[PDB]
């Protein structure tokens, strides 16, 4: 049969291609996840159709504890697989089965280049300087949870004026640190992204943390080990490495 | 119900504590993975005999199929979990159950300071500067199973004249790069390791791969998922980050 693969949009793991006329199917989609996916399907050869998830969240609980986002279509049963950019965090991993990391990296700063700033204690220690992270995601759920005392205060302020240094999206996120005096709390791996297209801006300090996406499957699915297996393959051959390159790519900065 | 865990001595992984007195059980060791499984135990709530692997090997097939080492020991049920730096590789993830990685590395260089050398593909293109890595180990297969020019061409190198280039152990590697014009080919963590406490060496280039240590678990083991689970909320309060401090810091170059 055909596995459902929820997954939702975001520069550059999924995107919808380009094209003179209107798209159907898998076709409408291309990018990193899109990539992945095919080489998966190529080595545990099966077919598949790529659905955007309906509300489209990653996956978090409302205050009754029931979930939303890709999260809840796996738990419900609705998709087999989940591929895009969901980071494998404790609370998600009790309700899901995740394979293994296809990619690495960590939380960090997005801010402007030639400046003073240096890292989150720099930023946790003033107040002219606004910053937060997109709403709902892993990001600003890191900073929420957090215990470490200069991650307490982040988030205090975060959470402060109704929530209001906190963004939508990446998108949004990005254009308030380009036009404003902001600082963005995200995901290294979609830093790097930014910042080697956009020499106005750098990353600052490094990672605060590890952490990794993985495939999700539902709980007890027997695709998760097969995954988690040809990802190892992939990685090991160095395919993972080439199709990161293949998407990243961008001309620099000095 | 007292779980037993297979392990290895490496450090700062696992070491023998120093007594002038002999030590028993648990107490003869002590390192960065023995803080990890106390931590562990305390979460999961379980009793644990640390064993050191019988034949002191990771884990690898010979040419009949046929596994040694602490991989060898979950499959055949002498161990309930391995507890070391253990490389979570495909070959391994087929006949064992990996819980999600505590430490991410890569394959990196060890070698001197102040050479020309700066990557891979410098020793790789040359012939006079000696280069491997330790036998049967995650690192020695990547490359022999590489099928990448630069990597196969290095393999061709280190399997050369019956592996002289390659050594037994880490320890080994480092005494022979520091005593001779010699590199060492392994995990970025160990090379950070021995780069705080030898100010004369020093890692060459970045890592030429992504990879972890994850704690190992007979298939079908019904402590893998909870592992992992235990694993991620560790990381996630910074527990993981301040082990590994606690064990790396030297004493400064
Ligand atoms: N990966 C995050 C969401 C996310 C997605 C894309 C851009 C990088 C990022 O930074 N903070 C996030 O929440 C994100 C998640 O799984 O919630
Ligand atoms: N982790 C490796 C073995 C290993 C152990 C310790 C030192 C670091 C290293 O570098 N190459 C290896 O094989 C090693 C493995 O699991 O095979
Ligand atoms: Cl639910
Ligand atoms: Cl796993």
Redesign the interface.
Not at 209 to 212: A, I, L, R, T, Y
Not at 235 to 238: I, L, M, P, R, V
């Given at each position: 049969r055909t596995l459902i693969v929820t997954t939702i949009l975001e520069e550059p793991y999924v995107m919808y291609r380009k094209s003179d006329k209107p798209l159907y199917g898998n076709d409408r989609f291309e990018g990193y996840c899109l990539d992945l996916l095919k080489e998966l399907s190529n080595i545990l050869g099966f077919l598949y159709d790529v659905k955007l998830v309906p509300d489209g969240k990653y996956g978090a609980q409302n205050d009754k504890g029931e979930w939303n986002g890709m999260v809840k279509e796996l738990i419900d049963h609705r998709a087999d697989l989940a591929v895009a950019p969901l980071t494998?965090?404790?609370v998600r991993?009790?309700v899901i089965?995740?394979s293994?990391?296809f990619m690495?990296l960590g939380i960090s700063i997005l801010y402007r280049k030639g400046t003073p700033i240096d890292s989150a204690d720099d930023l946790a220690k003033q107040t002219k300087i606004e910053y937060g992270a997109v709403r709902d995601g892993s990001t600003m759920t890191?900073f929420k949870?957090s215990?470490?005392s200069t991650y307490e205060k982040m988030w205090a302020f975060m959470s402060s004026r109704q929530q209001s240094a906190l963004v939508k999206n990446s998108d949004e996120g990005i254009q308030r640190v380009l036009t404003t005096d902001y600082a963005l709390l995200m995901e290294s791996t979609s830093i790097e992204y930014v910042t080697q297209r956009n020499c106005n801006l750098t990353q600052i300090g490094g990672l605060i943390?590890?952490?990794?996406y993985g495939v999700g499957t539902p709980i007890g699915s027997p695709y998760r080990?097969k995954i988690?297996?040809a990802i190892?393959?992939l990685?090991?051959?160095?395919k993972?490495?080439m199709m990161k390159e293949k998407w990243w790519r961008g001309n620099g900065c000095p």
């Open positions: 494998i965090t404790y991993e009790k089965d995740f293994k990391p690495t890191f949870k215990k470490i943390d590890s952490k990794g080990d988690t297996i190892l393959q990685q090991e051959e160095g993972l490495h």
